[PDB]
DNA sequence: GACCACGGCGCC
DNA sequence: AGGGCGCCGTGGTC
């Protein structure tokens, strides 16, 4: 390309280096942009974002966010890993796409700002005829880019203190149950190694092994294996309680108060677009998709998710999202009859799993009841269904049969999806996303039967996360006029900030986009709520 | 300081 | 031998 002067035309495509991958860290170490057979490269990068309309090209939404961070409005558009990434979404890297679809990626800005135009290039001639994936590109993962970048930029705030105090706490009480562990042990060890624990479990105790890991086949230590174990020796209590608070401190109380950005003064995650098999949306650095919800003491640190002052947080979840789905691409009049008719499958399931009446049921006992019903749907077996259950193996066998037997067109819908799979090599959502899975044909039952379970799954959870975006997509433009914020997706979760004068607004009017997003053979049904914090704004 | 593989486990 | 993820600490290694 012929070298010329900084600024680009306007439609440029552009190259960036960043000192690390997470933008709202990063320091912008160079800037390039190629158009027209040339390439211009910025004197300096931080002066240049300001001659930038548009971030185009490789990894848009990341130089978008950093701009936002600096003040800039410089929306992402085309990314040539999101038509990457649809053609096949086991295109999840940069490099990878880049040796796919034509040339390498570097670590010079010039380089990659050429590089994206001409992946642009032959990516966009892969997707001609190919109307459906298209569409998703233009009215889904393009648009929903821009979304991301205002999310990631916006972060959410965090109660710091409290986690501060919460990490003094929780460290007491592992003392006590480590102090316990070694003396039952006999001697110390270190607790967190699972070789060290397996060695003194089931050699120098002599409890009785269950399970095998997958890769490696030493006995394993896993939560299901020692919760078969609890009566059978009282150190097996103490270690179930000591990896629930050590989870918990570190993977959460301690590491999330250090990331608040100085700046802003909230903490930011990526949302990943390009990062999952079946479409989802991925979440890192850290993962805000997998905060504690659970028990009472992983609740505590959803407390430290708070609005800011004077704002609240809008929760919005989907109601049973993806038997809502199977329902439509299944076609079950049965299946379709329990939606039509408002009934809720998590809390009839929980009734019969906990023997009682559905008013009976709590929130603890339903939740628990979604594990069972996803599970059941997606392959699970009578083993592991009798084992968290505690019921007879018999009667597990039988649950598994009452399920299909209720509704006979969705065995029908996956063997057409799999037969499918087999023929195409890929199965697809509602909208026509697609995932290969080459292992359909496998001689090596184990294998060949997993493939199937992913087959089955992805139109599934795929169409699931497809009506999530698009919800996103037009929920948007609605907030930034109501001066509402986007905050966090929790797969078929939003999570909103809104005003505290504008709150009850905003939670009747996203739960209305979001209800009618995209209408299914069956209505969609989301729950809402309002708080302080995240706990609450789910209560 | 890092990369990776693993087991394990948090959420959806 | 439910599906989809990312992060922990350990272990081995460079
Ligand atoms: N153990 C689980 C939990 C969740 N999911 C997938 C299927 C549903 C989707 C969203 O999770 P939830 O909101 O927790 O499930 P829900 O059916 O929508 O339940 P709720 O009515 O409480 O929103 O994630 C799954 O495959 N396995
Ligand atoms: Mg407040
Ligand atoms: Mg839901
Ligand atoms: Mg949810
Ligand atoms: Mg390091
Ligand atoms: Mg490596």
């Given at each position: 390309l012929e070298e010329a002067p900084w600024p680009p035309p306007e439609g440029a495509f552009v190259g960036f280096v960043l000192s690390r991958k997470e933008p709202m860290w990063a320091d912008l170490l160079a800037l390039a942009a190629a158009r027209g057979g040339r390439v211009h490269r910025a004197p300096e990068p931080y002066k240049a974002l300001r001659d930038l309309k548009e971030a185009r090209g490789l990894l848009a939404k990341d130089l978008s966010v950093l701009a936002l961070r600096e003040g800039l409005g410089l929306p992402p558009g085309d990314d040539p890993m999101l038509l990457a990434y649809l053609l096949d979404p086991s295109n999840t890297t940069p490099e990878g796409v880049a040796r796919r679809y034509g040339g390498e990626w570097t670590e010079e800005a010039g380089e990659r700002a050429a590089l994206s135009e001409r992946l642009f290039a032959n990516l966009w001639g892969r997707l001609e005829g190919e109307e459906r994936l298209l569409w998703l590109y233009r009215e889904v993962e393009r648009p929903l880019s821009a979304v991301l970048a205002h999310m990631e930029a916006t972060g959410v705030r965090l109660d710091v203190a409290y986690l501060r105090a919460m990490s003094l706490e929780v460290a007491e009480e592992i003392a006590r149950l480590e102090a316990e562990v070694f003396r039952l042990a006999g001697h110390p060890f270190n607790l967190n190694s699972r070789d060290q624990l397996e060695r003194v479990l089931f050699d120098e105790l002599g409890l009785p092994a269950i399970g095998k890991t997958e890769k490696t086949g030493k006995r394993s230590t896993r939560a299901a294996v020692l919760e078969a174990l609890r009566e059978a020796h009282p150190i097996v209590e103490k270690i179930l309680q000591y990896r629930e608070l050590t989870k918990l401190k570190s993977t959460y109380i301690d590491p999330l108060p250090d990331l608040?950005?100085?700046?802003?003064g909230r903490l930011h995650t990526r949302f990943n677009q390009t990062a999952t098999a079946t479409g989802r949306l991925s979440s890192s650095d850290p993962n805000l998709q997998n905060i504690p919800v659970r028990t009472p003491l992983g609740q505590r640190i959803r407390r430290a998710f708070i609005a800011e002052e004077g704002w609240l947080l809008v929760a919005l979840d989907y109601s049973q999202i993806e038997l809502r789905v199977l329902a439509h691409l299944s076609g079950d009049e049965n299946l379709i009859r329990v939606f039509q008719e408002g009934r809720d499958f998590h809390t009839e399931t929980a009734s019969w799993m906990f023997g009682v009446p559905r008013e009976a049921v709590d929130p603890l006992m339903r939740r628990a009841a979604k594990t069972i019903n996803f599970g059941v749907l997606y392959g699970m077996s009578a083993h592991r269904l009798s084992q968290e259950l505690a019921i007879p193996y018999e009667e597990a066998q039988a649950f598994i049969e009452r399920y299909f037997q209720s509704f006979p067109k969705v065995r029908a819908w996956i063997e057409k999806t799999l037969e499918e799979g087999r023929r195409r090599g890929y199965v697809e959502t509602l909208f026509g996303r697609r995932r290969y899975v080459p292992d359909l044909e496998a001689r090596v039952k184990s294998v060949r039967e997993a493939a199937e379970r992913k087959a089955f799954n992805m139109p599934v959870q795929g169409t699931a996360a497809d009506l999530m975006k698009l919800a996103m997509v037009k929920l948007f433009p609605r907030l930034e006029e109501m001066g509402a914020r986007m905050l966090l997706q929790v797969h078929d979760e939003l999570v909103l900030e809104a005003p505290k004068e504008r709150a009850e607004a905003v939670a009747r009017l996203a739960k209305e986009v979001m209800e009618g997003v995209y209408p299914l053979a069956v209505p969609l049904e989301v729950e809402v709520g309002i708080g302080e914090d995240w706990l609450s704004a789910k209560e």
């Open positions: 608040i950005h100085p700046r802003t």
